[PDB]
Symmetry: C3
């Protein structure tokens, strides 16, 4: 009356997965491949602290806005952090030429050095160096940019200035200057004493002649006139020449920059933190190496591909609910006592149900599913892509093209990831069912006609099979001629 | 008394492709590709489109005299134009950021055309009576409706210092022009100042135009030119026009209540009131299916475009390999058994019968329905802004966009076909699984009370009446009852 | 006596990767990744490419004196440029929209260089003898062959009004230059006009250039500049040049007819006369394979570049020398002698040789796997690819966007393909594990209880079965009552 049954394992469950054919399927074990949390703090990126700007923008920090003195000491950074609505920067009204391009240049810079390209006293001995305005007020007092100097006429004369600088820093030198546009002709005749002024910025690769434009303009920050801002990158071994007779905001401090590639500027009000993380988002930082995430499309660093999914769970064990042939077939029950493995046997000579587990098939299935999951996670490589671009009001076609690229990538990744989850969950369930079916077939082949097939995955022995005989059956060392006669 | 296990067959001629086999006839199939369009420029979303007819966008905004039928159009869901519009820019000139302006105007829910500068009061000394034969309407020479040609009066052109403030709480499109004469004689006769200038300045825009006088080839029977410029005055902003000549003044500006993400279609199809969720130059597409092959550029709720001609998914069995069930021991499809997918044949007192086991059939239907519905539903449509326009100097852009779309088209066309093939095979491998298991179940119940014929049929040793057959079908076959 | 079922095995060391297992040795496999280039710049679409040699594109079109070997060109499919553009813009200056001109000159079906304004006849009131050491040739000062330097004559620089009509009925590329002297004295000595202007006007182009005198750093031992501008006169359009000085006039224009959009390849590899459909900077590749890892930048109908180093798909069984419970089940190892097919039987009793090969199952499996591989290869159809893009210093953002377009695509194709070749491989192996197993069952039901099931994939006939009845068994016919008792 001895019986040996073959079955699988079930536990407390409470974890669900989705397959191609069925939804809300409950499984013994599963793995999450979707990151859905962030620390809420702007950690360091690969050991390089971000350049926080606070109440200032990139234009103000580079130009030297008076109210931006809390961040003068900056040497190395990987990305630039901005508040959602910077309040300081371009205190004097004007237009920043190629501003977004300069921001992209400055997002990735090493060994940032601020150096006086033209000394305040030596460079301009014949000009009124001092120049201030109420728009760029500092501590309740009128002031001007720290890195620029408002040259004005001295002794009723503006001598023709011709100042040349050679790049001796063996790097690329960002040089910034400005051109002043008074709102009234008399203001020009007083500041520069020349109605027809000119500005000429010349390099081996740069050449531009700015001509002052005098007209009545709406008041911005209580100033009708406008200072236009321009910038250039002087290459090593190159010389830049400024030649002017008026309306020139002369450079004072230039910046030596090490070449950087591929970083972006994050705009968020979340706090900065001492932590170091390998992937940054505006709202937080993600430490997990899961293939996909559902936090924010704009990511900096080697980040998981963004998806529009809320659940991506992959099956790693048998279905916890008690197709192929074995599970939901001639064996529609789950041995909750199978705490040693996935596939096992049963004893009735002296033991009960759910006592031993066949570690061979269990180990084979474990290795197969582990390789499947590891391949799915690992096949994605590092990106280090600063997804997210900035375009002005005259570049809306650029904005829409970038939006289309990001949206297409998002849609492809979401669709493919969800499909793979469904198909591989179904295939994993089928794989477990095939493994247990093969185990039952092996037991049947070993027993031959010395046992009766009950129908519920059990065999009733035609002889007395003591515990050691059961060990022989499970070990594969069953001796049919021993009990044949 | 014999019980035979079999599957379903019918007269279906539907054909699918699998990974291992091609041109496979199946009992049932589902289409995932939409290839039919109504051929009508139907309504999109909830608003009707705007058709420019013979006119272009430039002629519409600037006020070409032949586009007088387009003045009353206040709101639109999307813009459609004839393939090669002729009206627009009647006076030769250069429209600065014209493609950019088209992109801005496409995503506009509604607009109000208002007289930014009244024709009489704004310019008292300046003569406002200026027309040309290049812009001719009803024989008489004419000029733009929303622009005005300023010329000197009594041999004098006083300096103009006009300004306007945005009180509409919406962005205001302002259009103006700068006239470049062919010869200095026209410059000194129409403006009386040989060296003129124009300055348009706001809180975010500032540009100075100096007239350029040179001999130019005749376009629309005209040597002189008029360069057109535009700006989008933000709410709470003021625009200033200051000039001593060669200024084409704005006469009508447009308060734009802007939308988001709309485009312009170059189509010649007639319009219809379909309220369709999708739109293409040729016609409209049903968004129910996940893939379409009608037109690459699409606007609205349009499915993903693919470069494939057939994407058919199996939702049934093979009409008339793995698990060895279909084309194995069972090699015939039961055309009579139309009740379900799998079943048995009656015998004994029952002369015949083609019963269909509803358990496995309903389970398979649920599974395959979930598969197909997952394939269709997992696809999201969102909104399509496919297509861009680039000028002659943005060729590098035109290729890059061409790289994008084609690239995506190379992915979706490939994967989908794989998805159609890879799953179809499995679908078939699903069906032959179920019946096989079903057979095994019967083979388990009868034990030695029946002999295995070999063709999916069991010959009962004992007499199996209708009640006994129903006992076998339900799985409650009483082995002790019929042991003898 | 006995009949055994088994699968084919050989000594092939070709290994593959599957979802569940890695380093799986298979009897046969197919490579789907191309990693070989001949190192030769084969011509594409049957048209020989244009190799500029040591000349930049600007030097070639402007007519650089050293770039005289590139004058006699008629047609090309793509442009090849050496990594060292030594020759080009010999006189310092700025080339307006140079990247766009390179983009629009990468593919020209018919290229003709015609003297739009003859040197001897167009300018009788001006001196045309303008040369400089910046563009010197054969040891003496020279100038661009396709441009002309106009200066004053008899101490006078009269007004210039020249017009050309597009009678070529093609796209007339016209190049001109504006000279910016370093000193006012040079301007007054060469052009005799301190305030000059150059107006270039057509039906769709109109630009006024004002000379900009300023002290400039010496680049080519020259403190002046010559800014270069160009336009494409449309058919039926007339171009007009009007200038009182500082004009570098056109001498030879080009009647272009643009073709299928292509790019520019930077390569120093030898230009061989092989013919190919795909081109890479390093060489040319297979293109019949759907995937490649030679170079991300490609020209022509090229396979989708992937970041994979091994993309191999199984076409046979697992090579086990001497799921579904087969291959790893009842037959632990496959026969190393059966070479006529993938599945077969073992002769015994009358003929103990053991030769057999079930042709029907083997051929069906071959057809299925061949259809799988052919579908995977063929379903990827790619048209002409021109992924190469060029952007200036002020278009870095654009460049990054292009990179984001490229790398992202590389992230997709790499992830899917490998994953795909991981999945189907396993399936293919499982497919084999189906067939053989089914074959075993087909024998079992055919032999019923006339044979003892040994369990190693064999049936030991209780009766005496000669070669004829064993062949009938392999034919699927076996009279069970005939051999019930023997
Ligand atoms: C740096 O950022 C701060 C914060 O935005 C700036 O303070 C702001 O300064 C403006 C004047 O420049 C203030 O506007 C004032 O509003 C009152 C309202 O009654 C009006 O009467 C005044 O005539 C003036 O328009 C604004 O209120 C003030 N905001 C705050 C929060 O302090 C500061 O000016 C910036 N500094 C630089 C150098 O950019
Ligand atoms: C994938 O599996 C193959 C074998 O199927 C590996 O090839 C074999 O790798 C061994 C590694 O030491 C090489 O050394 C040989 O080892 C054997 C013992 O296995 C030893 O008897 C020999 O004297 C020799 O030292 C061996 O040459 C090589 N080839 C063969 C035909 O055995 C391969 O390394 C595996 N790859 C991975 C990534 O695991
Ligand atoms: C076309 O390209 C050739 C080859 O590059 C140019 O020849 C010039 O060759 C010399 C060596 O013979 C290169 O070295 C330079 O020599 C000068 C003295 O001639 C010396 O002062 C420099 O310091 C340097 O060592 C020289 O770079 C090279 N010139 C250029 C522009 O690359 C030839 O001049 C080129 N012709 C034109 C019209 O661009
Ligand atoms: C506007 O386009 C039309 C053709 O689309 C041009 O042709 C005129 O068409 C109208 C009817 O729409 C006729 O009444 C005129 O006689 C046609 N004139 C010519 C010269 O063909 C028309 O010229 C265009 N008008 C403008 C101002 O561009
Ligand atoms: C080139 O690509 C083909 C794509 O099918 C690879 O396949 C070969 O195709 C040729 C031509 O049909 C056959 O003669 C070979 O027998 C095929 N070989 C295999 C392994 O399929 C081919 O291998 C590729 N060439 C390489 C990688 O050098
Ligand atoms: C499952 O529930 C039982 C309830 O008795 C509890 O003892 C056991 O610890 C639970 N196991 C898990 C893994 O939650
Ligand atoms: C689906 O699964 C979730 C698991 O969180 C469970 O809360 C919910 O009740 C289930 N619903 C159905 C209909 O099975
Ligand atoms: C300074 O520049 C003005 C404007 O071009 C010019 O008139 C004047 O002669 C110049 N003076 C010197 C000393 O260079
Ligand atoms: C399949 O083959 C039959 C037989 O020639 C043919 O009539 C039918 O059109 C084919 N269908 C397809 C889709 O190729
Ligand atoms: C367009 O032009 C054609 C040709 O002159 C004319 O017949 C037709 O009526 C015009 N349609 C509109 C809408 O202007
Ligand atoms: C108009 O502006 C010009 C600018 O050149 C100036 O010369 C002229 O005096 C102005 N008109 C009057 C009436 O002042
Ligand atoms: C002409 O009237 C306009 C309208 O304000 C004004 O700008 C201009 O000064 C007037 N001309 C005069 C007063 O000479
Ligand atoms: C391996 O098999 C191939 C194909 O049959 C054969 O050409 C080769 O000689 C074999 N090598 C060895 C060492 O048996
Ligand atoms: C290009 O210049 C290099 C300089 O070393 C020279 O070796 C090579 O022969 C030159 N090639 C041509 C085609 O002029
Ligand atoms: C040359 O052009 C200038 C500027 O356009 C003009 O002032 C002068 O009269 C012209 N001279 C001749 C001879 O055409």
């Amino acid at each position: 009356a001895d019986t040996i049954c073959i079955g699988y394992h079930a536990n407390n469950s409470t974890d669900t997965v989705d397959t191609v054919l069925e939804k809300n399927v409950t499984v013994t074990h599963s793995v999450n491949l979707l990151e859905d949390s962030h620390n809420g703090k702007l950690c360091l990126l690969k050991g390089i602290a971000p350049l926080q700007l606070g109440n200032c923008s990139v234009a103000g920090w580079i130009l030297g806005n008076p109210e931006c003195e809390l961040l003068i000491s900056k040497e190395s950074w990987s990305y630039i952090v901005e508040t959602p609505n910077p309040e300081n920067g371009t205190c004097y009204p004007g237009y920043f030429a190629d501003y977004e391009e300069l921001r992209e240049q400055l997002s990735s810079v090493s060994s940032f050095e601020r150096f006086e390209i033209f000394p305040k006293e030596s460079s301009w001995p014949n000009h009124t160096v001092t120049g201030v305005s109420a728009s760029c007020s500092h501590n309740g007092k009128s002031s001007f940019y720290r890195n620029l100097l408002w040259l004005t006429g001295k002794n009723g004369l503006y001598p023709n200035l011709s100042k040349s600088y050679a790049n001796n820093k063996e790097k690329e030198v960002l040089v910034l200057w400005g051109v002043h546009h008074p709102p009234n002709i008399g203001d020009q005749r007083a500041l520069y004493h020349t109605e027809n002024a000119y500005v000429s910025v010349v390099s081996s690769h740069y050449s531009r002649k700015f001509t002052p434009e005098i007209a009545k303009r709406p008041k911005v920050r209580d100033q009708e006139g406008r200072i236009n801002y321009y910038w250039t990158l002087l290459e090593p071994g190159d010389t830049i020449i400024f030649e002017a007779n008026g309306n020139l905001i002369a450079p004072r401090y230039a910046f030596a920059l090490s070449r950087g590639f591929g970083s972006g500027i994050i705009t968020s009000n979340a706090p900065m933190d001492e932590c170091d993380a390998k992937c940054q988002t505006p709202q937080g930082a993600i430490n997990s190496s899961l293939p996909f995430q559902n936090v924010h499309p704009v990511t900096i660093g080697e980040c998981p591909k963004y998806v529009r999914s809320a659940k991506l769970r992959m099956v790693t064990g048998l279905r916890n609910i008690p197709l192929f042939g074995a599970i939901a077939g001639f064996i529609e029950g789950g041995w909750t006592g199978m705490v040693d493995g996935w596939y096992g046997y049963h004893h009735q000579n002296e033991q009960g149900s759910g006592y031993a587990a066949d570690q061979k098939s269990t180990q084979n299935a474990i290795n197969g599913i582990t390789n499947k999951v590891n391949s799915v996670i690992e096949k994605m490589n590092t990106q280090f892509t600063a997804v997210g671009k900035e375009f002005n009001k005259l570049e809306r076609r650029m904005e829409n093209l970038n939006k289309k690229v990001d949206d297409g990538f998002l849609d492809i990744w979401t669709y493919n990831a969800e499909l793979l989850v469904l198909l591989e969950n179904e295939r994993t369930l089928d794989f477990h069912d095939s493994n247990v079916k093969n185990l039952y077939e092996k037991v049947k082949s070993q027993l031959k006609n010395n046992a009766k097939e009950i129908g519920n995955g059990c065999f009733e022995f035609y002889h007395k099979c003591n515990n050691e005989c059961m060990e022989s059956v499970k070990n594969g060392t069953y001796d049919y001629p021993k009990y044949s006669e």
